[PDB]
């Protein structure tokens, strides 16, 4: 009939077989879930702290923590926008504690790092054109940003195996403490924007939600938990050490820039569009206003240090060895095409190598609009990279620079934006440039691991199915929750009770502004702890 | 110390079976609605799962604009029911099957999601091919696929009939007035074929199982309440809104085609308006209603429509011609001295260049505040009785390009289901409040838990692993009157002078009831009470 | 707080605890990422051998082969194929002293990793690697050196530590490489001769090694793929000695032996169907619409370049082309190449003209750059057009000249030798199989008129690029003995014969002349025995 004759004959007994077509439906523990939202207590210590107390005889267990934030209406003048995934960037520290002490705690960046592969959680935290594009206010009562609510998923080890991994409450008081980063960190604004009044008026409005469970005759057994510990190395130092490492499941290593020496102001920002090309295109777009000028006679409004050359009939302008081809259509007979040959320049010695941003352009084509009296650029051939877009304005106009540096117009310089994102990694905005040439992890005196390529990041990205991973050394390949995690055992007597991380940073040119971007080595260690439920919830470090 | 082996495992010998992909041609019936019945009866088909319904879409020849709805295959389905001689084993509404498959990109692509199918193609001559014939595959996700062979529907000499009820072709087609739909509806016939993975099991040992059956309840038009009666054991409860376009002719100004992003919907609308928004003509433009206020753009370039300023600068405009702006392209007002919702006011800057060769304006950059809601307003609502103004001040040429959209699975008030119209949700089990929220936190949880971008306000009661465990359900007490689920929503406030305020709403409540699958004297399901 | 309706609903029967679990102490082990430099050997194919022998290393899984791509300096156009790393691989074989434990063909490893976005990105998928870069001076850098990571997906990764290859024995991983010609897209201007001579594969094999204290090894099962390629254009292929098979995949591949592998256009990193079409349209437009003072020069005598009338419409037979270019100088006129690319087998029969595939062309002439800037193009160009090798236009079969493009355009043509191309087009869109018949022995096992098996393969594996696959194993892997198709040697039921029916094409269309190759992949079941070293045995 429907089944083929070759199949029926292949089947139509003497061996014991496991049933793959039916299963015994196990009766589970009698419970009832409920989404519970709580309003917290706001404190200033002058850091914003929100405390949420969970105490109920019927809330037997809980997991899936979601912190909601009410972002206010932003009215006034100037340019303003929120950082991508604003909600995650608001968080400085989170700590779930009982009367016996801290059960679990995470740093704001580490929670984000754990949620970087969760697209849904990142969207909920605030990732829209309404929130992340840089909006402009024209009148003191003009609405720059409309009020919005963001949802931050606080990923905890209690979510791993849903009900099985859930934090149990043996009639104990659980307090979730959320420490907030200053509003400066989550905002991208210009000089025109009245940040002084904004910082004063802004208040974090949080609300903690969780899936609560009412369990009838709960049978609680002890469990294991992984607690992260980050160690930040000294400025520009290629070393960091994690002390008292006794039982670790993993070890992550990454870099962070230190923009302390700068005013955190940058020439361009793409907004909601976060691709590498989007960052580059925004920078090229900002420079082009001053790079190619259509004026009657030499252009005015530029510093005396600026060297603006008229484009010859051949269209090619020679800035040293570099050739720039500039051809603009429909230019009035009374006007000429001009090129800024030193828009942004850097040097350490008077007659040495020069890093000129104008030299990074090979071809510029467009058409002059008589109606709008502005140039409309068609095709741009350049060698502008993600690093160029990531240079603070301070480094161009620094003491180390023998030249003026920023030879842009006053109009362009006014459009510069303050970026204080607390979760920037590497030396560029997209964390593209791998400044670690070699990594060395020493457990005591002996070398635990060494690599010349980011093969540990490659394994991290592959194993966790993440497109943005870190150089991570995983020690636990055992199933979580149902097994005691596999940890690196420490020998205190032999001095093997600390993890020392040493990197070999890539050498950069002294005449390139990015050389002066201070680096910081971050080392994260996931320590194993045992969750005991005898006389309340309590954790103990595995040693 | 006793240790569990994590490096080796005893390879258990499974039940001796043989899978086979079986395709069946059904029986078409009509009354007034199309029905396809597929009978599965074979002594060797021991079990089955993974139902796939294929559809042969015909060649579309003639004149006018035509296109299929995205994921056309899923939109064709009105209802699906897997039944035995003892009765219905499982059944789902067309929309609910789509809702369950919205997170499956592969299943959505197979159902028909291409530029060849979803972009709006145009026919010029009565024998011009608008759309080429194509075959679409609709994955009928059933609870028998959850744990593959373990969850599969067992037969054993019993007859299984899969009944597929189809929505009218009107629902799956986007067309203009120029297209001869009358002839198309008459000529169109659904050509289905049901495929499934059949299993021939040697000495099958069948044990009873559990199944979740969805039940949707649709509220009255503009009623913020809906009640699901006889709830005894429910695994989940979903709540969402749907627009009712009965008061309209289902015609819309623009559609983006295959490109389905929010920006794509907006860009298509801006593109359609721009033809009438900025006019380059010798003297005042003609062909517009008397209600239209087309103002000549001054040397300054700025045209002031009340408080709103529009900057219009078009290059290479001939000396005999002038630049004009339609200051009231689309407007709405309940009263003569109320707020006015003007679409022309939603534009801040328009720049372009007039082409002498093609005698048309080529727009370069447009600065506007157009949203997804604007693109989702039916043309009928602009020209409604509530409007003291004309409403649609567009040209006859533009109005002719309007498209009929009858997608049966539209949610909320906009085409992208962006705008949340529920301000407060109240769920009652019997008469006592089971759940209440002021924020879409149940939806945020639904999206997080399912790893989905398009979720609903869902109340999940079952957090226990499926198939291997009896699902955790909300227990009912008939004596205490707790044998029903009543949903009440508070709709979000909007200004009466906005045309979207007049979009009729319908509250949809879906309840997943628990049933026990018994295999004694044939396949039969029993409601858990 | 918990609602009053809930507390009353709760506040004899054996219940399984879903809120707490006994934390089982696992086998004492220690993982370590181990990287090894191999031994390079040399139709003089590159072979890399990696020997794994260590007393500490007890088991291994997750093989990742890294490759150091060198700096590419010189003149001309050059670029790497998308997912370059996977394309480099010709064959991989994990073997012991007892023989081959597991082996896969380069294409099959890629086919298994086509649904893994992370693994495909790591192998080399960037604008830096896949976009076609141009060198101007003999010392100009075309491509900067880069490292690519190829994830060698093996059955030892399925259930992590449980599925891992135990070697408590010397394990040798042998990686055979495809020639550099296969992984490179270049023009005639590029000195490939010197590049092929200078290029050397620089591999390094990484794996997650495990040091297990008192390992308890039990036997396991493994699926080994076997591909059979049919004779050129033959619609039949047979896989012999089929005794226990878990699956059977069937697909088509183009054979470009009769061609010089040169193509008119390539989109680079942008790999969408529209990207492939847009690149082709962009390349043709340079010669399709010409703005010149008098008739255009530099084209063959065979070319028919007609001046566009005041009306704007040029009639190439039944087909009408609307061409209107703005700001054209007073001394110049708009011209249209009416036979840019044409094909026919008879002098006065059907003509496949690429110029006929255009309905409207609009743009503006730039006086500054002296070139036309195209705004909107209305055409009927498909993925197949972009996939036609240049050889076929200028073939002996063609009565006409064929390639009526300028010498400038013809110079820009690129050699594409990608080893993992499927179907007849670059995006594997066109379905050329009309019917599929699979026979086990002499009896028909499966038959289909539609790609319902491909639909099931795509659905079940959650892949957007699947093949016509017959799966026999729906049983959980590693923890169960896989369900296989049983053979009957006496009845002569020990082979799988695949017969297809290709949908025939128009002989006046150049794509008809693209050679086909039927590919049939069979996954045979093998038993992994650990008695006196690692060894595999075919289930019969
Ligand atoms: C993470 O989950 C693990 C917890 C282990 O630790 C324990 C203590 O907790 C268990 C729980 C909570 C179960 O639900 C089990 C289960 O359902 C089993 C088997 C019986 O092997 C089990 O042995 C367990 C089992 C444990 O040992 N399945 C069955 O009997 C049936 C009727 C079918 C099984 C089908 C396949 C073959 C199975 O799904 C496989 C593909 C894996 O997914 C599982 C083995 C899980 O391994 C992993 C690595 O994912 C484990 C359940």
């Amino acid at each position: 009939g429907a089944m083929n004759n070759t199949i029926i004959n292949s089947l139509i007994d003497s061996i014991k077989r496991s049933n793959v077509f039916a299963v015994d439906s196990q009766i589970p523990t009698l419970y009832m879930p409920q989404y519970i939202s709580l309003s917290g207590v706001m404190t200033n210590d002058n850091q914003a702290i929100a405390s949420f107390e969970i105490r109920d005889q019927y809330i037997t267990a809980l997991n899936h923590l979601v912190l909601s934030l009410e972002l206010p209406e932003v009215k006034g003048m100037g340019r303003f926008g929120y950082v991508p995934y604003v909600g995650y960037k608001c968080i400085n520290h989170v700590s779930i504690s009982s009367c016996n002490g801290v059960i679990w705690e995470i740093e704001g960046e580490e929670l984000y790092n754990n949620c970087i592969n969760n697209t849904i959680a990142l969207k909920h935290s605030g990732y829209s054109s309404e929130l992340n594009d840089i909006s402009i206010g024209l009148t003191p009562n003009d609405t720059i940003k409309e009020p919005s609510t963001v949802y931050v998923y606080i990923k905890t080890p209690f979510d791993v195996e849903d009900t099985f991994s859930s934090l149990k409450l043996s009639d104990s008081k659980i307090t979730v403490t959320v420490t907030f980063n200053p509003v400066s960190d989550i905002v991208i604004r210009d000089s025109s924007f009245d940040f002084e009044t904004f910082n004063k008026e802004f208040v974090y409005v949080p609300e903690l939600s969780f899936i609560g469970y009412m369990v009838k005759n709960v049978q609680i057994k002890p469990s294991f938990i992984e607690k992260p510990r980050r160690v930040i190395g000294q400025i520009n130092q290629p070393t960091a050490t994690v002390t008292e490492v006794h039982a670790a499941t993993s070890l992550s290593v990454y870099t962070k820039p230190y923009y302390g020496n700068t005013d955190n102001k940058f020439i361009s920002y793409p907004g909601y569009s976060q691709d590498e090309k989007d960052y580059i295109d925004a920078y090229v777009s900002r420079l082009l206003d001053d790079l190619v000028i259509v004026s009657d006679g030499p252009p005015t409004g530029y510093p005396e240090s600026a060297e603006i050359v008229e484009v010859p009939e051949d269209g090619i302008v020679s800035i040293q060895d570099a050739d720039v081809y500039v051809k603009i259509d429909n230019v009035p007979d009374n006007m000429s095409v001009y090129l800024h040959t030193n828009l942004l320049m850097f040097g350490t010695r008077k007659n040495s190598f020069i890093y000129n941003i104008s030299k990074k352009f090979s071809a510029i084509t467009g058409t002059y609009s008589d109606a709008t009296k502005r140039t409309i650029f068609a095709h741009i051939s350049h060698s502008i990279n993600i690093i160029d877009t990531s240079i603070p304005v301070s480094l161009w106009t620094s003491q180390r620079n023998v030249y003026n540096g920023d030879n842009r117009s006053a109009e362009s310089k006014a459009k510069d934006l303050f970026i204080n994102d607390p979760f920037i990694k590497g030396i560029d905005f997209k964390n593209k440039t791998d400044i670690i040439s070699r990594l060395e992890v020493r457990f005591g005196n002996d070398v635990l691991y060494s690599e010349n390529g980011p093969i540990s990041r490659i394994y991290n990205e592959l194993l966790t199915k993440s497109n943005n991973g870190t150089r991570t050394l995983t020690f636990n390949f055992t199933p979580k929750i149902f097994f005691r995690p596999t940890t690196i055992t420490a020998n205190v007597s032999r001095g093997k009770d600390k993890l020392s991380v040493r990197v070999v940073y890539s050498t950069m040119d002294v005449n390139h502004p990015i050389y002066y971007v201070q680096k910081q080595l971050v080392v994260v260690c996931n320590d194993l702890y045992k969750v005991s439920y005898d006389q309340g919830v309590s954790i103990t470090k595995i040693m």
Side-chain angles (χ1 to χ4, degrees), chain A residues 98-110:
Chain A
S98 77
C99 294
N100 295 286
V102 176
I103 307 303
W104 191 79
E105 67 186 317
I106 204 161
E107 277 289 317
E109 194 166 13
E110 297 318 306

Side-chain angles (χ1 to χ4, degrees), chain A residues 23 479 482-483:
Chain A
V23 73
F482 308 103
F483 291 89

Side-chain angles (χ1 to χ4, degrees), chain A residues 83 184-185 187-189 259 263-269 279 389 417-421 424 429:
Chain A
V83 297
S184 178
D185 296 347
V187 160
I188 299 143
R189 80 278 182 182
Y259 297 113
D263 74 333
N264 289 80
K265 226 182 176 198
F266 296 85
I267 302 147
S268 72
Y269 191 74
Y279 270 97
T389 79
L417 302 159
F418 296 100
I419 306 156
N420 294 85
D421 202 315
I424 308 163
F429 283 121

